[PDB]
Amino acid sequence: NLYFQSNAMKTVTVRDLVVGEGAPKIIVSLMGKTITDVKSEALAYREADFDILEWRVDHFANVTTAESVLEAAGAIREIITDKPLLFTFRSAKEGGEQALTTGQYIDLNRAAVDSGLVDMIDLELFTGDDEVKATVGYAHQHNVAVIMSNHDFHKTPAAEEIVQRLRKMQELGADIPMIAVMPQTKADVLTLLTATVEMQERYADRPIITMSMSKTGVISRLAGEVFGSAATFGAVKKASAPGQISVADLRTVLTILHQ
Amino acid sequence: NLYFQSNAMKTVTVRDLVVGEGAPKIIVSLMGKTITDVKSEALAYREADFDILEWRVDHFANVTTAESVLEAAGAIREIITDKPLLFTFRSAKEGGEQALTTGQYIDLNRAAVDSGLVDMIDLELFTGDDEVKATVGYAHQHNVAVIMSNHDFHKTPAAEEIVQRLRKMQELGADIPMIAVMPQTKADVLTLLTATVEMQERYADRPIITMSMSKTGVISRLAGEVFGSAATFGAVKKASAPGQISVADLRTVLTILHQA
Ligand SMILES: O=C(O)[C@]1(O)C[C@@H](O)[C@@H](O)[C@H](O)C1
Ligand SMILES: O=C(O)[C@]1(O)C[C@@H](O)[C@@H](O)[C@H](O)C1
């Protein structure tokens, strides 16, 4: 593996895909419980118009069996050969389906990095500063990029707190800081957009991904080009988080806004 | 004429079109210099998918000749018979093509109200409280609804000032307060949306229309359903203000956003 990054241009290039330039990139989540479910999903996804494939490993039943994880990743790579693969174990507390100890989670991500089968890994900021920082370094030594993430499924923190978290992710070495928050009011949606603008304009030297979840926050998933979110999640069959619209509708809006 | 308005439901119903309910309504602007132009545009516009037809009277060369204005309004009504017609003389300082004295402007709108050919008129807030309140009263006596408008083509005032102007329009009797501002930064676009939300949630007992102009503010023309702007302007072939996108693309996005 080998990816490129330009601090000056605020871009990260994985498999020829230039993140942080032009229209926002579409990410879709693959969720399969077993290895054949993963194969079936990968086959169905092959035709969808997305840019990055996220494997939601927390949906995989045999996540604690090293060989099963490798077989699943290999199966995805054999079916989806030309697009960046992002390895994401999303913890239950942050919107996921299972929970691992810190040691298991870190070991899991290290094994994914070692496999050479994934282009990117997701690391949750709140896992711990030292553990996260060591794992970012480890990923980079193997030419694997890192999307560092944080989520709040109940509320939207103040704009300044959102900005400080995104800056913290940069500090720890994240290639692409990412934050997802839940609006309780319309103003909360604007708060997330305000933080996106402030971060991207005054502190960022790389791409960032932000979103206000739920139907109320969907505009944050569409207006990335103007406000500064480099990527956005769409749904193929079903949503991996509240607020995502179909990949087809997402592409339609991104194209209309790019022109 | 006769239009309905429900303060409790925050709607205004003109020609069976319920403004303030469901997806935002699309307004397009007809901009002809002469009768030929006005007629040609009306015929072409008949093919477009829009809800309200705005006649930008400030683009009309014979705007000071009563009979010409009447002939043009009649021509538009003959062609577009199923959509509300909004009569708008936009002054040069607020983005228009001509300028009239206060007297000429008030007389122009009273004559438009008298004609029975237009469903709505646009009245600029900065025309003065006395003249504006009197003219709103006049339109209502004739069953003509009023969109009261304000524009700032150089900057975006603070949200608090934006809200103050929208509340003032409401106080003056405007059926639909409307404001258009120009962003100098990305934050300015969000400031306009902040004001929209605050007005619609805390003070409005009727629909409002808001927009942040330019390509930078285009999101304010698309997300009216979630933030609280009841209508949005699209372009048929030429934009009547910076930031408008094609009517076809506008409807496409509004529909996607309205989807359950
Ligand atoms: O689109 C979102 O809001 C997501 O929550 C973003 C990120 O957390 C992904 O890992 C999820 O699968 C979806
Ligand atoms: O879409 C706009 O920004 C407009 O300026 C809104 C309103 O002022 C109309 O009268 C114009 O024709 C267009």
Short mmCIF file of all heavy atoms in Angstrom, two decimals, chain A residues 185-187 189-190 193-195 197 200-201 215-219 222-223 225-228 245 249-250 252-253 256-257 259, chain B residues 185-187 189-190 193-195 197 201 215-219 222-223 225-227 245 249-250 252-253 256-260:
data_model
loop_
_atom_site.label_atom_id
_atom_site.label_comp_id
_atom_site.label_asym_id
_atom_site.label_seq_id
_atom_site.Cartn_x
_atom_site.Cartn_y
_atom_site.Cartn_z
N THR A 185 -32.59 20.40 17.82
CA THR A 185 -33.30 21.57 17.28
C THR A 185 -32.71 21.91 15.92
O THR A 185 -31.66 21.40 15.55
CB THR A 185 -33.08 22.82 18.17
OG1 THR A 185 -31.69 23.20 18.14
CG2 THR A 185 -33.51 22.54 19.61
N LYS A 186 -33.36 22.82 15.18
CA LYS A 186 -32.87 23.22 13.85
C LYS A 186 -31.55 23.96 14.04
O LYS A 186 -30.62 23.80 13.25
CB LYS A 186 -33.82 24.17 13.12
CG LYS A 186 -35.30 23.87 13.15
CD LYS A 186 -35.72 22.67 12.36
CE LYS A 186 -37.24 22.73 12.20
NZ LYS A 186 -37.77 21.76 11.22
N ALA A 187 -31.48 24.81 15.07
CA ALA A 187 -30.26 25.55 15.37
C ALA A 187 -29.06 24.62 15.51
O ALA A 187 -27.96 24.96 15.06
CB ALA A 187 -30.43 26.38 16.64
N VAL A 189 -28.35 22.04 13.89
CA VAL A 189 -27.84 21.70 12.56
C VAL A 189 -26.87 22.80 12.11
O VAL A 189 -25.76 22.53 11.63
CB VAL A 189 -28.97 21.52 11.53
CG1 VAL A 189 -28.40 21.13 10.17
CG2 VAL A 189 -29.96 20.47 12.00
N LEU A 190 -27.28 24.05 12.33
CA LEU A 190 -26.46 25.20 11.98
C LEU A 190 -25.19 25.26 12.82
O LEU A 190 -24.13 25.65 12.33
CB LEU A 190 -27.27 26.49 12.09
CG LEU A 190 -28.52 26.52 11.20
CD1 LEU A 190 -29.35 27.77 11.44
CD2 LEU A 190 -28.16 26.38 9.71
N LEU A 193 -22.68 22.98 11.21
CA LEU A 193 -22.14 23.65 10.02
C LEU A 193 -21.19 24.80 10.38
O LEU A 193 -20.17 24.99 9.73
CB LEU A 193 -23.27 24.15 9.11
CG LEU A 193 -24.16 23.05 8.52
CD1 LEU A 193 -25.34 23.66 7.80
CD2 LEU A 193 -23.37 22.12 7.60
N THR A 194 -21.52 25.56 11.43
CA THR A 194 -20.64 26.64 11.89
C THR A 194 -19.26 26.11 12.30
O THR A 194 -18.23 26.69 11.95
CB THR A 194 -21.29 27.40 13.06
OG1 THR A 194 -22.35 28.22 12.56
CG2 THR A 194 -20.29 28.29 13.79
N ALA A 195 -19.25 24.99 13.02
CA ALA A 195 -18.01 24.37 13.47
C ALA A 195 -17.22 23.85 12.29
O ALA A 195 -16.00 23.94 12.28
CB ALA A 195 -18.30 23.25 14.46
N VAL A 197 -17.19 25.06 9.23
CA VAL A 197 -16.60 26.22 8.57
C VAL A 197 -15.39 26.75 9.34
O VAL A 197 -14.30 26.92 8.76
CB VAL A 197 -17.63 27.35 8.40
CG1 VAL A 197 -16.97 28.61 7.86
CG2 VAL A 197 -18.74 26.90 7.45
N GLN A 200 -12.35 24.16 9.20
CA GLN A 200 -11.79 24.03 7.87
C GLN A 200 -11.06 25.30 7.43
O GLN A 200 -10.01 25.22 6.78
CB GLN A 200 -12.90 23.64 6.87
CG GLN A 200 -12.40 23.03 5.56
CD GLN A 200 -11.80 24.05 4.60
OE1 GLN A 200 -12.35 25.13 4.40
NE2 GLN A 200 -10.68 23.68 3.98
N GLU A 201 -11.58 26.46 7.81
CA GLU A 201 -10.99 27.74 7.40
C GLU A 201 -9.80 28.20 8.25
O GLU A 201 -8.81 28.71 7.71
CB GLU A 201 -12.06 28.85 7.35
CG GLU A 201 -13.06 28.70 6.20
CD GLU A 201 -14.00 29.88 6.03
OE1 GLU A 201 -14.20 30.66 6.99
OE2 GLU A 201 -14.54 30.04 4.92
N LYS A 215 -33.03 13.01 9.88
CA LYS A 215 -33.67 13.71 8.76
C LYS A 215 -33.50 15.23 8.91
O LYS A 215 -33.27 15.93 7.93
CB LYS A 215 -35.15 13.33 8.68
CG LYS A 215 -35.90 13.96 7.50
CD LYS A 215 -37.35 13.48 7.46
CE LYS A 215 -38.21 14.29 6.50
NZ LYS A 215 -37.79 14.18 5.08
N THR A 216 -33.57 15.74 10.15
CA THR A 216 -33.43 17.17 10.40
C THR A 216 -32.05 17.73 9.98
O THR A 216 -31.92 18.90 9.60
CB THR A 216 -33.68 17.50 11.90
OG1 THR A 216 -34.99 17.06 12.27
CG2 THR A 216 -33.57 18.99 12.16
N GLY A 217 -31.02 16.90 10.05
CA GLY A 217 -29.68 17.35 9.70
C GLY A 217 -29.19 16.98 8.31
O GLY A 217 -28.04 17.25 7.98
N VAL A 218 -30.06 16.41 7.47
CA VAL A 218 -29.63 15.92 6.15
C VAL A 218 -28.91 16.94 5.24
O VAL A 218 -28.07 16.56 4.42
CB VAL A 218 -30.79 15.22 5.38
CG1 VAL A 218 -31.85 16.22 4.94
CG2 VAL A 218 -30.25 14.46 4.18
N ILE A 219 -29.21 18.23 5.40
CA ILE A 219 -28.56 19.25 4.59
C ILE A 219 -27.04 19.24 4.83
O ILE A 219 -26.25 19.56 3.93
CB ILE A 219 -29.19 20.65 4.83
CG1 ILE A 219 -28.92 21.56 3.65
CG2 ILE A 219 -28.74 21.24 6.15
CD1 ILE A 219 -29.64 21.15 2.38
N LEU A 222 -25.34 17.06 2.38
CA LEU A 222 -25.43 17.50 1.00
C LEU A 222 -24.60 18.73 0.64
O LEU A 222 -24.12 18.84 -0.49
CB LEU A 222 -26.90 17.79 0.68
CG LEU A 222 -27.90 16.67 1.00
CD1 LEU A 222 -29.32 17.10 0.72
CD2 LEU A 222 -27.56 15.41 0.22
N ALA A 223 -24.41 19.64 1.59
CA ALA A 223 -23.73 20.91 1.32
C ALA A 223 -22.23 20.94 1.65
O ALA A 223 -21.69 22.01 1.95
CB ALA A 223 -24.44 22.02 2.07
N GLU A 225 -19.50 20.69 -0.23
CA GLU A 225 -18.60 21.42 -1.11
C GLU A 225 -18.43 22.87 -0.64
O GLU A 225 -17.31 23.36 -0.55
CB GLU A 225 -19.06 21.37 -2.57
CG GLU A 225 -17.96 21.76 -3.55
CD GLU A 225 -18.24 21.34 -4.99
OE1 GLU A 225 -19.18 20.56 -5.25
OE2 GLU A 225 -17.50 21.79 -5.89
N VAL A 226 -19.54 23.53 -0.33
CA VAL A 226 -19.46 24.91 0.13
C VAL A 226 -18.96 25.01 1.57
O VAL A 226 -18.04 25.78 1.83
CB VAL A 226 -20.82 25.65 0.01
CG1 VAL A 226 -20.78 26.99 0.72
CG2 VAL A 226 -21.18 25.85 -1.45
N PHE A 227 -19.51 24.22 2.49
CA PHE A 227 -19.13 24.37 3.91
C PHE A 227 -17.85 23.67 4.35
O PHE A 227 -17.25 24.07 5.35
CB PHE A 227 -20.31 24.09 4.83
CG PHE A 227 -21.44 25.06 4.62
CD1 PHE A 227 -22.60 24.66 3.97
CD2 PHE A 227 -21.31 26.39 5.00
CE1 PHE A 227 -23.63 25.57 3.74
CE2 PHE A 227 -22.32 27.30 4.77
CZ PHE A 227 -23.49 26.89 4.15
N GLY A 228 -17.39 22.67 3.59
CA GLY A 228 -16.09 22.08 3.87
C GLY A 228 -15.99 20.68 4.43
O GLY A 228 -14.98 20.36 5.05
N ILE A 245 -29.41 9.30 2.95
CA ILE A 245 -30.37 9.11 1.87
C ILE A 245 -29.76 8.12 0.89
O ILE A 245 -28.59 7.73 1.06
CB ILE A 245 -30.80 10.44 1.19
CG1 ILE A 245 -29.63 11.11 0.46
CG2 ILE A 245 -31.41 11.38 2.21
CD1 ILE A 245 -30.02 12.38 -0.29
N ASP A 249 -29.83 9.36 -4.84
CA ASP A 249 -30.29 10.72 -4.52
C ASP A 249 -29.12 11.60 -4.06
O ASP A 249 -29.07 12.77 -4.38
CB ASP A 249 -31.39 10.71 -3.46
CG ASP A 249 -32.72 10.22 -4.00
OD1 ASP A 249 -32.92 10.16 -5.23
OD2 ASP A 249 -33.59 9.89 -3.17
N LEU A 250 -28.18 11.02 -3.32
CA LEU A 250 -27.02 11.76 -2.84
C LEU A 250 -26.17 12.21 -4.04
O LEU A 250 -25.80 13.37 -4.16
CB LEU A 250 -26.21 10.87 -1.90
CG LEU A 250 -24.97 11.44 -1.22
CD1 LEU A 250 -25.30 12.70 -0.45
CD2 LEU A 250 -24.39 10.37 -0.30
N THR A 252 -27.13 12.63 -7.04
CA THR A 252 -27.91 13.61 -7.80
C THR A 252 -27.71 15.02 -7.22
O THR A 252 -27.41 15.96 -7.95
CB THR A 252 -29.40 13.25 -7.81
OG1 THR A 252 -29.60 12.01 -8.51
CG2 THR A 252 -30.23 14.35 -8.47
N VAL A 253 -27.84 15.15 -5.90
CA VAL A 253 -27.69 16.46 -5.25
C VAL A 253 -26.25 17.00 -5.34
O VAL A 253 -26.05 18.16 -5.63
CB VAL A 253 -28.16 16.42 -3.78
CG1 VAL A 253 -27.91 17.77 -3.11
CG2 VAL A 253 -29.64 16.06 -3.71
N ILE A 256 -25.67 18.35 -8.79
CA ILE A 256 -26.38 19.61 -8.99
C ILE A 256 -25.66 20.78 -8.31
O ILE A 256 -25.53 21.86 -8.87
CB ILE A 256 -27.86 19.50 -8.54
CG1 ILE A 256 -28.63 18.63 -9.53
CG2 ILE A 256 -28.51 20.88 -8.41
CD1 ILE A 256 -30.04 18.26 -9.11
N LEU A 257 -25.14 20.53 -7.11
CA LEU A 257 -24.43 21.57 -6.36
C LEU A 257 -23.02 21.81 -6.88
O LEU A 257 -22.45 22.87 -6.63
CB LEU A 257 -24.36 21.22 -4.87
CG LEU A 257 -25.69 21.22 -4.13
CD1 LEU A 257 -25.51 20.71 -2.71
CD2 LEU A 257 -26.29 22.62 -4.14
N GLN A 259 -22.15 21.79 -10.11
CA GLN A 259 -22.30 22.59 -11.32
C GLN A 259 -22.61 24.03 -10.96
O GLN A 259 -22.99 24.83 -11.82
CB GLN A 259 -23.44 22.03 -12.19
CG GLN A 259 -23.30 20.57 -12.63
CD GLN A 259 -22.07 20.31 -13.49
OE1 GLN A 259 -20.93 20.44 -13.03
NE2 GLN A 259 -22.30 19.89 -14.73
N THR B 185 -19.04 35.91 3.43
CA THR B 185 -18.35 34.74 3.96
C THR B 185 -19.33 33.57 4.11
O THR B 185 -20.55 33.76 4.03
CB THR B 185 -17.82 35.00 5.39
OG1 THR B 185 -18.94 35.22 6.27
CG2 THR B 185 -16.91 36.20 5.40
N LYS B 186 -18.80 32.38 4.35
CA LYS B 186 -19.64 31.20 4.54
C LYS B 186 -20.50 31.35 5.79
O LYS B 186 -21.67 30.98 5.78
CB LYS B 186 -18.78 29.93 4.60
CG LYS B 186 -18.13 29.65 3.25
CD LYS B 186 -17.15 28.49 3.30
CE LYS B 186 -16.51 28.30 1.93
NZ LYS B 186 -15.62 27.12 1.94
N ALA B 187 -19.94 31.93 6.84
CA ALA B 187 -20.68 32.18 8.06
C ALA B 187 -21.92 33.05 7.81
O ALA B 187 -22.96 32.83 8.43
CB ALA B 187 -19.79 32.84 9.12
N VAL B 189 -23.91 33.00 5.36
CA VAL B 189 -25.00 32.14 4.89
C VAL B 189 -25.70 31.51 6.10
O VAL B 189 -26.94 31.47 6.18
CB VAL B 189 -24.50 31.02 3.97
CG1 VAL B 189 -25.68 30.17 3.48
CG2 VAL B 189 -23.71 31.60 2.80
N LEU B 190 -24.91 31.05 7.06
CA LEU B 190 -25.48 30.44 8.26
C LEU B 190 -26.21 31.48 9.11
O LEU B 190 -27.21 31.16 9.74
CB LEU B 190 -24.40 29.70 9.07
CG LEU B 190 -23.70 28.56 8.31
CD1 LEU B 190 -22.64 27.91 9.15
CD2 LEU B 190 -24.69 27.51 7.82
N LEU B 193 -29.68 31.76 7.75
CA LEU B 193 -30.46 30.60 8.18
C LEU B 193 -30.83 30.69 9.67
O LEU B 193 -31.95 30.37 10.04
CB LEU B 193 -29.72 29.29 7.87
CG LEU B 193 -29.55 28.99 6.37
CD1 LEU B 193 -28.71 27.75 6.15
CD2 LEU B 193 -30.91 28.84 5.71
N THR B 194 -29.90 31.14 10.51
CA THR B 194 -30.16 31.33 11.94
C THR B 194 -31.34 32.26 12.15
O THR B 194 -32.23 31.98 12.93
CB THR B 194 -28.90 31.86 12.67
OG1 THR B 194 -27.95 30.80 12.80
CG2 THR B 194 -29.22 32.40 14.04
N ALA B 195 -31.35 33.37 11.42
CA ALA B 195 -32.43 34.36 11.50
C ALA B 195 -33.76 33.80 11.04
O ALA B 195 -34.81 34.11 11.62
CB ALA B 195 -32.07 35.56 10.63
N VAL B 197 -34.73 30.61 11.09
CA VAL B 197 -35.21 29.71 12.12
C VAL B 197 -35.82 30.49 13.29
O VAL B 197 -36.93 30.20 13.71
CB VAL B 197 -34.07 28.79 12.63
CG1 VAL B 197 -34.53 27.99 13.84
CG2 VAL B 197 -33.63 27.84 11.52
N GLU B 201 -39.82 30.27 14.11
CA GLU B 201 -40.18 29.56 15.34
C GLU B 201 -40.76 30.43 16.46
O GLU B 201 -41.70 30.00 17.14
CB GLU B 201 -38.98 28.77 15.88
CG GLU B 201 -38.57 27.60 15.01
CD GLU B 201 -37.50 26.72 15.62
OE1 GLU B 201 -36.78 27.17 16.54
OE2 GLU B 201 -37.36 25.57 15.17
N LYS B 215 -23.81 31.83 -5.39
CA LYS B 215 -23.58 30.39 -5.35
C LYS B 215 -23.27 29.93 -3.93
O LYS B 215 -23.71 28.86 -3.49
CB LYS B 215 -22.47 29.99 -6.33
CG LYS B 215 -22.88 30.19 -7.78
CD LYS B 215 -21.84 29.69 -8.77
CE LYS B 215 -22.36 29.79 -10.20
NZ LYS B 215 -21.43 29.20 -11.19
N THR B 216 -22.54 30.76 -3.19
CA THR B 216 -22.19 30.44 -1.81
C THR B 216 -23.42 30.24 -0.92
O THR B 216 -23.40 29.42 -0.03
CB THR B 216 -21.29 31.52 -1.20
OG1 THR B 216 -20.07 31.61 -1.96
CG2 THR B 216 -20.96 31.18 0.25
N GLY B 217 -24.50 30.98 -1.18
CA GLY B 217 -25.71 30.84 -0.37
C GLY B 217 -26.79 29.92 -0.92
O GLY B 217 -27.89 29.85 -0.37
N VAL B 218 -26.49 29.18 -1.98
CA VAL B 218 -27.50 28.35 -2.65
C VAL B 218 -28.25 27.39 -1.71
O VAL B 218 -29.43 27.11 -1.93
CB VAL B 218 -26.90 27.58 -3.84
CG1 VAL B 218 -26.01 26.45 -3.36
CG2 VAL B 218 -28.01 27.04 -4.74
N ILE B 219 -27.59 26.93 -0.65
CA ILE B 219 -28.24 26.01 0.28
C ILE B 219 -29.48 26.64 0.93
O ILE B 219 -30.44 25.94 1.26
CB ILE B 219 -27.25 25.48 1.35
CG1 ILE B 219 -27.69 24.11 1.83
CG2 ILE B 219 -27.06 26.50 2.47
CD1 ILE B 219 -27.63 23.06 0.72
N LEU B 222 -32.57 25.85 -1.05
CA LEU B 222 -32.95 24.44 -1.13
C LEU B 222 -33.52 23.85 0.15
O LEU B 222 -34.37 22.97 0.08
CB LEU B 222 -31.71 23.62 -1.51
CG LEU B 222 -30.95 24.09 -2.75
CD1 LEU B 222 -29.66 23.30 -2.91
CD2 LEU B 222 -31.81 23.99 -3.99
N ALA B 223 -33.07 24.35 1.31
CA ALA B 223 -33.44 23.77 2.60
C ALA B 223 -34.55 24.51 3.32
O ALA B 223 -34.57 24.56 4.55
CB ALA B 223 -32.21 23.70 3.50
N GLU B 225 -37.65 23.78 3.70
CA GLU B 225 -38.58 22.93 4.44
C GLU B 225 -38.14 22.72 5.89
O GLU B 225 -38.95 22.87 6.80
CB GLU B 225 -38.81 21.59 3.73
CG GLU B 225 -40.08 20.91 4.22
CD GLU B 225 -40.49 19.68 3.42
OE1 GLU B 225 -40.09 19.53 2.25
OE2 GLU B 225 -41.22 18.84 3.98
N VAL B 226 -36.87 22.39 6.10
CA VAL B 226 -36.37 22.17 7.45
C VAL B 226 -36.16 23.48 8.22
O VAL B 226 -36.46 23.54 9.40
CB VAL B 226 -35.06 21.36 7.45
CG1 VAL B 226 -33.96 22.11 6.71
CG2 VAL B 226 -34.61 21.05 8.87
N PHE B 227 -35.64 24.51 7.56
CA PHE B 227 -35.37 25.79 8.25
C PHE B 227 -36.51 26.80 8.33
O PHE B 227 -36.52 27.66 9.21
CB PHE B 227 -34.08 26.44 7.74
CG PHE B 227 -32.87 25.58 7.94
CD1 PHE B 227 -32.12 25.13 6.86
CD2 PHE B 227 -32.46 25.23 9.23
CE1 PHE B 227 -31.00 24.33 7.07
CE2 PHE B 227 -31.35 24.44 9.44
CZ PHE B 227 -30.61 23.99 8.36
N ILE B 245 -30.79 28.53 -9.23
CA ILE B 245 -30.46 27.41 -10.11
C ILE B 245 -31.68 27.12 -10.98
O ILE B 245 -32.75 27.68 -10.75
CB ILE B 245 -30.03 26.14 -9.34
CG1 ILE B 245 -31.14 25.58 -8.46
CG2 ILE B 245 -28.81 26.44 -8.48
CD1 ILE B 245 -30.75 24.29 -7.77
N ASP B 249 -33.79 21.54 -11.69
CA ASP B 249 -32.90 21.08 -10.61
C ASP B 249 -33.44 21.47 -9.24
O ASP B 249 -33.32 20.70 -8.29
CB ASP B 249 -31.48 21.64 -10.77
CG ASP B 249 -30.70 21.00 -11.92
OD1 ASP B 249 -31.09 19.94 -12.42
OD2 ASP B 249 -29.66 21.57 -12.31
N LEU B 250 -34.04 22.65 -9.14
CA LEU B 250 -34.62 23.12 -7.88
C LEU B 250 -35.73 22.17 -7.42
O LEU B 250 -35.72 21.72 -6.27
CB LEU B 250 -35.14 24.56 -8.05
CG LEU B 250 -35.73 25.28 -6.84
CD1 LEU B 250 -34.71 25.33 -5.71
CD2 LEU B 250 -36.18 26.68 -7.22
N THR B 252 -36.19 19.09 -8.29
CA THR B 252 -35.57 17.79 -8.00
C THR B 252 -35.06 17.72 -6.56
O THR B 252 -35.32 16.76 -5.83
CB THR B 252 -34.41 17.51 -8.98
OG1 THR B 252 -34.96 17.32 -10.29
CG2 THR B 252 -33.63 16.26 -8.58
N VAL B 253 -34.35 18.76 -6.15
CA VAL B 253 -33.81 18.80 -4.80
C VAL B 253 -34.91 18.96 -3.75
O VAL B 253 -34.89 18.26 -2.73
CB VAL B 253 -32.74 19.90 -4.65
CG1 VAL B 253 -32.28 19.98 -3.19
CG2 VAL B 253 -31.56 19.60 -5.56
N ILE B 256 -36.56 15.61 -3.23
CA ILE B 256 -35.68 14.71 -2.47
C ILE B 256 -35.74 15.04 -0.98
O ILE B 256 -35.86 14.15 -0.14
CB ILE B 256 -34.23 14.76 -3.02
CG1 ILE B 256 -34.17 13.99 -4.35
CG2 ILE B 256 -33.24 14.14 -2.03
CD1 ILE B 256 -32.89 14.17 -5.16
N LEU B 257 -35.68 16.33 -0.65
CA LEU B 257 -35.72 16.78 0.74
C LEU B 257 -37.08 16.62 1.39
O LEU B 257 -37.16 16.52 2.61
CB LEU B 257 -35.27 18.23 0.84
CG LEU B 257 -33.79 18.44 0.53
CD1 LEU B 257 -33.42 19.92 0.59
CD2 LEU B 257 -32.93 17.64 1.50
N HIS B 258 -38.14 16.60 0.59
CA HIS B 258 -39.48 16.41 1.13
C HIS B 258 -39.76 14.92 1.41
O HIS B 258 -40.56 14.60 2.29
CB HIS B 258 -40.52 17.01 0.18
CG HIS B 258 -41.92 16.89 0.67
ND1 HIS B 258 -42.39 17.62 1.74
CD2 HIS B 258 -42.96 16.13 0.25
CE1 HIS B 258 -43.66 17.32 1.96
NE2 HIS B 258 -44.03 16.41 1.07
N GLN B 259 -39.10 14.03 0.67
CA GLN B 259 -39.28 12.57 0.83
C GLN B 259 -39.25 12.14 2.29
O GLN B 259 -38.31 12.47 3.02
CB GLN B 259 -38.20 11.80 0.07
CG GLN B 259 -38.29 11.90 -1.45
CD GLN B 259 -37.18 11.17 -2.19
OE1 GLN B 259 -37.20 11.09 -3.42
NE2 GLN B 259 -36.20 10.64 -1.46
N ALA B 260 -40.26 11.37 2.70
CA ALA B 260 -40.37 10.88 4.07
C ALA B 260 -39.16 10.02 4.45
O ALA B 260 -38.58 9.33 3.61
CB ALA B 260 -41.65 10.08 4.25
#
